[PDB]
Amino acid sequence: DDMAKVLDAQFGKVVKHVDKTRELRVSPLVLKRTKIDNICYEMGQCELSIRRAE
RNA sequence: GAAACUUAAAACCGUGUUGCACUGCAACCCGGAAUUCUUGCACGUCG
Questions:
Q1: Nucleotide lying nearest to A32, CA to C1' measure
Q2: Computed from CA positions of residues A38, A40, A44, A49, in that sequence, does the dihedral angle turn out positive or negative?
Q3: Which of A36, A29, A37, A23 lies closest to A8 in space, CA to CA?
Q4: In the 8-state DSSP scheme, what is residue A15?
Q5: How far is Cα A6 from Cα A18, in angstroms, rounded to an integer?
Q6: Residues 1-54 of A with CB under 7 A from strand B
Q7: For residue A37, which phi and psi values (nearest 5 degrees)?
Q8: How many whole angstroms separate alpha carbon A35 and alpha carbon A43?
Q9: Which end of chain A is more exposed for a tag (fewer CB within 10 A), N or C?
C-alpha cells in the first residue's frame, strides 16, 4: 500500500490504484510476462554469479 | 729780475676651423610542479 500512493501521485485519472490495491493486495496490478510460443516467463530476469579472478 | 705750452698730428692693426682616427660592444631558454575530475539503470504506468 506504500507503493500505491506514489503511483497515484503521477497517475490516477486513468485507473484508480488506491481502491484496487486493497481488494486483492497486489502492487503493481500486472506482471510483465512474455511468450516465445513455448513457455510463459517474465521480462528481464537474469542469473548472477561471480568469482575473484586475478 | 719782472714777460713768451719739446708743442701739433698718429687705431697695436692685417691674415688664421679646437681640427684629424674611434660600433655602448661581448656572454645569458620566461624556465621548473599540476588528470576537465567526483555522484547518475533510456525508465515507469495498462477497462
A1: B46
A2: negative
A3: A29
A4: S
A5: 10
A6: 7, 10-11, 14-15, 17, 28-30, 32
A7: 75, -5
A8: 9
A9: C
